[PDB]
Amino acid sequence: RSGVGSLFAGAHIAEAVPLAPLTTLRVGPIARRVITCTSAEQVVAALRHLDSAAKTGADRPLVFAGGSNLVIAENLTDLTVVRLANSGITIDGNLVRAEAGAVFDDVVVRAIEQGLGGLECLSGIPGSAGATPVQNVGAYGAEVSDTITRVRLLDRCTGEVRWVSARDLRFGYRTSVLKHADGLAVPTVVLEVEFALDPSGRSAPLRYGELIAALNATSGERADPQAVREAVLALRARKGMVLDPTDHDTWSVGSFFTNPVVTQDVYERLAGDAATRPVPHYPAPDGVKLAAGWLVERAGFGKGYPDAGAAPCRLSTKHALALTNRGGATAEDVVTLARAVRDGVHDVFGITLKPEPVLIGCML
Amino acid sequence: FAGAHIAEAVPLAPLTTLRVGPIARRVITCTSAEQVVAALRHLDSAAKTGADRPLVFAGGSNLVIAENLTDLTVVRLANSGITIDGNLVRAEAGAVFDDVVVRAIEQGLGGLECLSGIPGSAGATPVQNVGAYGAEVSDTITRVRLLDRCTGEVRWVSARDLRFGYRTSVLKAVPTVVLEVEFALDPSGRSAPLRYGELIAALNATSGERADPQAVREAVLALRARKGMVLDPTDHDTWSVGSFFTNPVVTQDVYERLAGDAATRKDGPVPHYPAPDGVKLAAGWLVERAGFGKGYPDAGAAPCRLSTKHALALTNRGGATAEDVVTLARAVRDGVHDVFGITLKPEPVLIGCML
Ligand SMILES: Cc1cc2nc3c(=O)[nH]c(=O)nc-3n(C[C@H](O)[C@H](O)[C@H](O)COP(=O)(O)OP(=O)(O)OC[C@H]3O[C@@H](n4cnc5c(N)ncnc54)[C@H](O)[C@@H]3O)c2cc1C
Ligand SMILES: Cc1cc2nc3c(=O)[nH]c(=O)nc-3n(C[C@H](O)[C@H](O)[C@H](O)COP(=O)(O)OP(=O)(O)OC[C@H]3O[C@@H](n4cnc5c(N)ncnc54)[C@H](O)[C@@H]3O)c2cc1C
Ligand SMILES: [K+]
Ligand SMILES: [K+]
């Protein structure tokens, strides 16, 4: 059938591979082996062999795609990496299907240019399509759970491949069943994602105040998707949230923390504690969602922190939530600064912020 | 109408499970999605309006049609393909739903088996989130291909945008027609988990176990047979639209009032089911407790009676009219309201008639 003569059905194998340059953060160990898969058959056959042979706590493989949400400890000297390069975008009426290794922003653009609305708010988010369901990737008032119909999944332990519905993924705010406290584990691999979009050519309803203002629209109004993408790309540039290899503010894994959901009591206390001398909140179904960025800034961790020095890890000069590599950072530098922001916001507010990126061999 | 078959003066009664309906002016039978879409586009722009709107039809298992609708144009969906594609099953609107179930079981795909024996088409299933025996088609549908009748536009719509709930979806005020349904099923060949007390008991198993889909099917078919809820043309208990009323979802205090009274009278407990938004009661227990036994009325030879095996099913006893169905329905609804304070809601769609 498929690459029968070769190991892993034809996947590329390389040894002693610096992972740092493959990551947006530019942090990482030299991987002992990298196995690069360009098809679903390769991803399945590669993991089957590695999962069948893996015996010890040093042998679980790191599944790696765009490298935009990974903080990988430099200590990990005995690491095998499976790299998902199985790309491919199909248009099927108002449906768009993207293999895991497609570049997510590419899916957005293809969708917009078919006159299909629904992804435009997610323009400029880096990384792969296959990663999007894992944490229900979102920005600017949209999330991929607003349009995903189903996901093609490899269950690594049984070797079964099937399609799973959006409903069975149990999407919530920055979560799904695929999201695990441990980001190495990845017992289930996304091979392909399908989205169902709006063939009338209208964007999703605009649900995010900064974007709405920028287009001179009102809340829940629909607009031209391309115009929405252009505004979103401008909003993201201002925050250093579009990759730009000459700008260190962009040497990140984006926002380092999820917006926390607090009980209505704790929102009203802060609403009071700041009524002397207006507290950002977003609607959410089981409490109030607070802006992590407003919390981080109020606890003293502003844009550029720490300001004095040549700190190798700073918070972005354009967006306080993003940790950045200024040139020579290590994983521990990133974890250290993140811990302090996290500890600091708890000292002030009594809110524990959860990290949004995936920390391999490091914890907070 | 891109090759649609057009018949004139077609009796609808024999096309309905209730054996009630008018002689339609024209029946436009569509055997492809293209015909369905061509027909509805022309007819919907032509209509001038109320009674010129066409009735969308399919399996005839959930409709009560007034016999005096002599000017009725009907579009009958008979696009019937069924495609298996790994663990995905795609069924055109006109496919027989139970054949989709059988086809999935035959391929080793689990998830549809608890829906064995429900009559009518695949296309109709999302409209009221068809279900029984602890399953609903919302548990497996990924998306539905729809014609928006207001814009003439055709598109796939996700499960989520259909807003499925207990006997409802957004399709049940935009008319749309479902053209095709996709289901994602379980290729390990295990059933959905067994959640329904009657079915678990009948298999000798535990709540949450899975079983062979075929054995689940046979159990469910035998239980449905005991209630007159599989089509059997010699049994008048099955000349129905199934359960005529949906299980009402009441605030928890309405439930509690009832459960107190029943405990005092010693005729409890009040059977009830999970609901996100209060407590769901067995409409059948309300009907019987309000005085309307299985076979009601027993006196004389009523042309409409409640099934002798399932009180919730209004049945055509030979020669019923729509007026008889609606007259019996109104009494069962009024009596339940009078005894319990609960307003039951009709499950079938009523064309030219009302409670
Ligand atoms: C400048 C910048 C801006 C950002 N803005 C946003 C934003 O607005 N919103 C947002 O949600 N995120 C944002 N991110 C985070 C990141 O881009 C997204 O999370 C992205 O979806 C990660 O994709 P990746 O392919 O790079 O994942 P990787 O970093 O390659 O992988 C990360 C984790 O996902 C797992 N994973 C990857 N592929 C699969 C698969 N196919 N199946 C199962 N598990 C898998 C990996 O094992 C690992 O556990 C931003 C990042 C940067 C650097
Ligand atoms: C013996 C018996 C047992 C039953 N058991 C059950 C049960 O266990 N659970 C349950 O839910 N139901 C049950 N029913 C009700 C009925 O079988 C289901 O509602 C069925 O899915 C209806 O299918 P149909 O094709 O016969 O619809 P029809 O009767 O042809 O049409 C019903 C309504 O749905 C609309 N409709 C039909 N197809 C479409 C479409 N493609 N797009 C948009 N609208 C459409 C029609 O316009 C009409 O408004 C039972 C019925 C009988 C007679
Ligand atoms: K992030
Ligand atoms: K019914």
PDB file of N, CA and C in Angstrom, chain A residues 259-309:
ATOM      1  N   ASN A 259      -7.200  33.808  30.287  1.00  0.00           N
ATOM      2  CA  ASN A 259      -8.194  34.546  31.023  1.00  0.00           C
ATOM      3  C   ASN A 259      -8.968  33.686  32.032  1.00  0.00           C
ATOM      4  N   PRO A 260      -8.833  33.965  33.347  1.00  0.00           N
ATOM      5  CA  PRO A 260      -9.470  33.111  34.355  1.00  0.00           C
ATOM      6  C   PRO A 260     -10.940  33.442  34.548  1.00  0.00           C
ATOM      7  N   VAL A 261     -11.699  32.411  34.903  1.00  0.00           N
ATOM      8  CA  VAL A 261     -13.148  32.542  35.150  1.00  0.00           C
ATOM      9  C   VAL A 261     -13.284  32.518  36.639  1.00  0.00           C
ATOM     10  N   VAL A 262     -13.906  33.541  37.169  1.00  0.00           N
ATOM     11  CA  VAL A 262     -14.077  33.628  38.616  1.00  0.00           C
ATOM     12  C   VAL A 262     -15.568  33.655  38.937  1.00  0.00           C
ATOM     13  N   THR A 263     -15.881  33.295  40.187  1.00  0.00           N
ATOM     14  CA  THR A 263     -17.257  33.383  40.714  1.00  0.00           C
ATOM     15  C   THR A 263     -17.724  34.831  40.697  1.00  0.00           C
ATOM     16  N   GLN A 264     -19.034  35.005  40.640  1.00  0.00           N
ATOM     17  CA  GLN A 264     -19.646  36.335  40.535  1.00  0.00           C
ATOM     18  C   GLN A 264     -19.269  37.193  41.775  1.00  0.00           C
ATOM     19  N   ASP A 265     -19.166  36.553  42.948  1.00  0.00           N
ATOM     20  CA  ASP A 265     -18.699  37.208  44.180  1.00  0.00           C
ATOM     21  C   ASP A 265     -17.362  37.879  43.899  1.00  0.00           C
ATOM     22  N   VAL A 266     -16.364  37.087  43.479  1.00  0.00           N
ATOM     23  CA  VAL A 266     -15.033  37.645  43.325  1.00  0.00           C
ATOM     24  C   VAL A 266     -14.975  38.725  42.248  1.00  0.00           C
ATOM     25  N   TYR A 267     -15.817  38.670  41.216  1.00  0.00           N
ATOM     26  CA  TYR A 267     -15.899  39.816  40.297  1.00  0.00           C
ATOM     27  C   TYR A 267     -16.451  41.062  40.974  1.00  0.00           C
ATOM     28  N   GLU A 268     -17.461  40.908  41.834  1.00  0.00           N
ATOM     29  CA  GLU A 268     -18.094  42.105  42.443  1.00  0.00           C
ATOM     30  C   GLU A 268     -17.151  42.732  43.506  1.00  0.00           C
ATOM     31  N   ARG A 269     -16.402  41.903  44.257  1.00  0.00           N
ATOM     32  CA  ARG A 269     -15.397  42.400  45.199  1.00  0.00           C
ATOM     33  C   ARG A 269     -14.386  43.286  44.458  1.00  0.00           C
ATOM     34  N   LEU A 270     -13.795  42.785  43.374  1.00  0.00           N
ATOM     35  CA  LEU A 270     -12.898  43.611  42.550  1.00  0.00           C
ATOM     36  C   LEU A 270     -13.624  44.815  41.924  1.00  0.00           C
ATOM     37  N   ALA A 271     -14.871  44.612  41.528  1.00  0.00           N
ATOM     38  CA  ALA A 271     -15.658  45.733  41.021  1.00  0.00           C
ATOM     39  C   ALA A 271     -15.757  46.814  42.122  1.00  0.00           C
ATOM     40  N   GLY A 272     -15.919  46.391  43.387  1.00  0.00           N
ATOM     41  CA  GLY A 272     -15.882  47.301  44.565  1.00  0.00           C
ATOM     42  C   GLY A 272     -14.514  47.861  44.959  1.00  0.00           C
ATOM     43  N   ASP A 273     -13.561  46.967  45.243  1.00  0.00           N
ATOM     44  CA  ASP A 273     -12.127  47.305  45.493  1.00  0.00           C
ATOM     45  C   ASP A 273     -11.464  48.250  44.467  1.00  0.00           C
ATOM     46  N   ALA A 274     -12.088  48.406  43.288  1.00  0.00           N
ATOM     47  CA  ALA A 274     -11.674  49.359  42.238  1.00  0.00           C
ATOM     48  C   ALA A 274     -12.683  50.480  41.957  1.00  0.00           C
ATOM     49  N   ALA A 275     -13.925  50.341  42.435  1.00  0.00           N
ATOM     50  CA  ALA A 275     -14.851  51.483  42.555  1.00  0.00           C
ATOM     51  C   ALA A 275     -14.255  52.602  43.411  1.00  0.00           C
ATOM     52  N   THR A 276     -13.292  52.254  44.276  1.00  0.00           N
ATOM     53  CA  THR A 276     -12.391  53.199  44.971  1.00  0.00           C
ATOM     54  C   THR A 276     -10.943  53.089  44.367  1.00  0.00           C
ATOM     55  N   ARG A 277     -10.432  54.048  43.577  1.00  0.00           N
ATOM     56  CA  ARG A 277     -11.120  55.226  43.035  1.00  0.00           C
ATOM     57  C   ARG A 277     -12.271  54.857  42.099  1.00  0.00           C
ATOM     58  N   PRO A 278     -13.066  50.814  36.195  1.00  0.00           N
ATOM     59  CA  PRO A 278     -13.976  49.802  35.615  1.00  0.00           C
ATOM     60  C   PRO A 278     -13.232  48.511  35.242  1.00  0.00           C
ATOM     61  N   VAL A 279     -13.567  47.394  35.899  1.00  0.00           N
ATOM     62  CA  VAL A 279     -12.841  46.097  35.777  1.00  0.00           C
ATOM     63  C   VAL A 279     -13.202  45.319  34.503  1.00  0.00           C
ATOM     64  N   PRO A 280     -12.238  45.066  33.596  1.00  0.00           N
ATOM     65  CA  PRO A 280     -12.606  44.250  32.442  1.00  0.00           C
ATOM     66  C   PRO A 280     -13.195  42.866  32.807  1.00  0.00           C
ATOM     67  N   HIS A 281     -14.322  42.559  32.163  1.00  0.00           N
ATOM     68  CA  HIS A 281     -14.937  41.257  32.257  1.00  0.00           C
ATOM     69  C   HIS A 281     -15.527  40.860  30.901  1.00  0.00           C
ATOM     70  N   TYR A 282     -15.547  39.561  30.667  1.00  0.00           N
ATOM     71  CA  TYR A 282     -16.133  39.007  29.476  1.00  0.00           C
ATOM     72  C   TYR A 282     -17.238  38.032  29.945  1.00  0.00           C
ATOM     73  N   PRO A 283     -18.324  37.902  29.151  1.00  0.00           N
ATOM     74  CA  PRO A 283     -19.335  36.897  29.494  1.00  0.00           C
ATOM     75  C   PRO A 283     -18.779  35.462  29.406  1.00  0.00           C
ATOM     76  N   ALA A 284     -19.220  34.614  30.326  1.00  0.00           N
ATOM     77  CA  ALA A 284     -18.888  33.187  30.322  1.00  0.00           C
ATOM     78  C   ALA A 284     -20.023  32.416  31.008  1.00  0.00           C
ATOM     79  N   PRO A 285     -20.147  31.104  30.726  1.00  0.00           N
ATOM     80  CA  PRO A 285     -21.360  30.422  31.150  1.00  0.00           C
ATOM     81  C   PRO A 285     -21.405  30.026  32.652  1.00  0.00           C
ATOM     82  N   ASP A 286     -20.249  29.922  33.326  1.00  0.00           N
ATOM     83  CA  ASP A 286     -20.189  29.494  34.751  1.00  0.00           C
ATOM     84  C   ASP A 286     -19.325  30.428  35.643  1.00  0.00           C
ATOM     85  N   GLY A 287     -19.590  31.723  35.515  1.00  0.00           N
ATOM     86  CA  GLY A 287     -18.909  32.744  36.310  1.00  0.00           C
ATOM     87  C   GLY A 287     -18.586  33.922  35.418  1.00  0.00           C
ATOM     88  N   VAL A 288     -17.661  34.777  35.864  1.00  0.00           N
ATOM     89  CA  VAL A 288     -17.211  35.936  35.065  1.00  0.00           C
ATOM     90  C   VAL A 288     -15.782  35.663  34.544  1.00  0.00           C
ATOM     91  N   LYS A 289     -15.546  35.962  33.278  1.00  0.00           N
ATOM     92  CA  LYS A 289     -14.210  35.804  32.705  1.00  0.00           C
ATOM     93  C   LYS A 289     -13.497  37.142  32.905  1.00  0.00           C
ATOM     94  N   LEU A 290     -12.322  37.120  33.540  1.00  0.00           N
ATOM     95  CA  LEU A 290     -11.533  38.384  33.706  1.00  0.00           C
ATOM     96  C   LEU A 290     -10.427  38.425  32.638  1.00  0.00           C
ATOM     97  N   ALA A 291     -10.031  39.633  32.199  1.00  0.00           N
ATOM     98  CA  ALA A 291      -8.821  39.776  31.356  1.00  0.00           C
ATOM     99  C   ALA A 291      -7.496  39.547  32.135  1.00  0.00           C
ATOM    100  N   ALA A 292      -6.843  38.408  31.894  1.00  0.00           N
ATOM    101  CA  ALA A 292      -5.524  38.123  32.457  1.00  0.00           C
ATOM    102  C   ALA A 292      -4.540  39.265  32.302  1.00  0.00           C
ATOM    103  N   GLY A 293      -4.603  39.940  31.176  1.00  0.00           N
ATOM    104  CA  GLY A 293      -3.697  41.036  30.881  1.00  0.00           C
ATOM    105  C   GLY A 293      -3.882  42.181  31.877  1.00  0.00           C
ATOM    106  N   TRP A 294      -5.123  42.480  32.270  1.00  0.00           N
ATOM    107  CA  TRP A 294      -5.398  43.564  33.232  1.00  0.00           C
ATOM    108  C   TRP A 294      -4.935  43.176  34.643  1.00  0.00           C
ATOM    109  N   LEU A 295      -4.965  41.875  34.923  1.00  0.00           N
ATOM    110  CA  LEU A 295      -4.542  41.355  36.190  1.00  0.00           C
ATOM    111  C   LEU A 295      -3.014  41.410  36.300  1.00  0.00           C
ATOM    112  N   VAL A 296      -2.326  40.883  35.283  1.00  0.00           N
ATOM    113  CA  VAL A 296      -0.886  40.884  35.176  1.00  0.00           C
ATOM    114  C   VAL A 296      -0.361  42.341  35.368  1.00  0.00           C
ATOM    115  N   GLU A 297      -0.953  43.322  34.690  1.00  0.00           N
ATOM    116  CA  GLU A 297      -0.493  44.714  34.754  1.00  0.00           C
ATOM    117  C   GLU A 297      -0.708  45.341  36.164  1.00  0.00           C
ATOM    118  N   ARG A 298      -1.851  45.056  36.779  1.00  0.00           N
ATOM    119  CA  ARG A 298      -2.172  45.539  38.109  1.00  0.00           C
ATOM    120  C   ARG A 298      -1.280  44.936  39.197  1.00  0.00           C
ATOM    121  N   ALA A 299      -0.809  43.700  39.016  1.00  0.00           N
ATOM    122  CA  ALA A 299       0.138  43.070  39.917  1.00  0.00           C
ATOM    123  C   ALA A 299       1.588  43.530  39.680  1.00  0.00           C
ATOM    124  N   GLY A 300       1.785  44.522  38.824  1.00  0.00           N
ATOM    125  CA  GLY A 300       3.121  45.051  38.524  1.00  0.00           C
ATOM    126  C   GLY A 300       3.905  44.482  37.377  1.00  0.00           C
ATOM    127  N   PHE A 301       3.354  43.528  36.630  1.00  0.00           N
ATOM    128  CA  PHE A 301       4.099  42.941  35.517  1.00  0.00           C
ATOM    129  C   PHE A 301       3.621  43.572  34.237  1.00  0.00           C
ATOM    130  N   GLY A 302       4.217  44.714  33.937  1.00  0.00           N
ATOM    131  CA  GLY A 302       3.867  45.496  32.756  1.00  0.00           C
ATOM    132  C   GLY A 302       4.645  45.102  31.528  1.00  0.00           C
ATOM    133  N   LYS A 303       4.295  45.724  30.404  1.00  0.00           N
ATOM    134  CA  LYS A 303       5.018  45.540  29.143  1.00  0.00           C
ATOM    135  C   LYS A 303       6.491  45.801  29.362  1.00  0.00           C
ATOM    136  N   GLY A 304       7.360  44.893  28.930  1.00  0.00           N
ATOM    137  CA  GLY A 304       8.806  45.090  29.023  1.00  0.00           C
ATOM    138  C   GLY A 304       9.474  44.573  30.285  1.00  0.00           C
ATOM    139  N   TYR A 305       8.682  44.111  31.247  1.00  0.00           N
ATOM    140  CA  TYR A 305       9.198  43.580  32.494  1.00  0.00           C
ATOM    141  C   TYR A 305      10.108  42.340  32.326  1.00  0.00           C
ATOM    142  N   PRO A 306      11.337  42.298  32.899  1.00  0.00           N
ATOM    143  CA  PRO A 306      11.944  43.388  33.657  1.00  0.00           C
ATOM    144  C   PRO A 306      12.691  44.332  32.724  1.00  0.00           C
ATOM    145  N   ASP A 307      12.551  45.596  33.059  1.00  0.00           N
ATOM    146  CA  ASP A 307      12.823  46.766  32.257  1.00  0.00           C
ATOM    147  C   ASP A 307      14.311  47.117  32.294  1.00  0.00           C
ATOM    148  N   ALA A 308      14.855  47.064  33.516  1.00  0.00           N
ATOM    149  CA  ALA A 308      16.265  47.299  33.812  1.00  0.00           C
ATOM    150  C   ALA A 308      17.082  46.018  33.611  1.00  0.00           C
ATOM    151  N   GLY A 309      18.089  46.103  32.752  1.00  0.00           N
ATOM    152  CA  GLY A 309      18.984  44.991  32.470  1.00  0.00           C
ATOM    153  C   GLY A 309      19.002  44.676  30.987  1.00  0.00           C
TER     154      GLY A 309
END
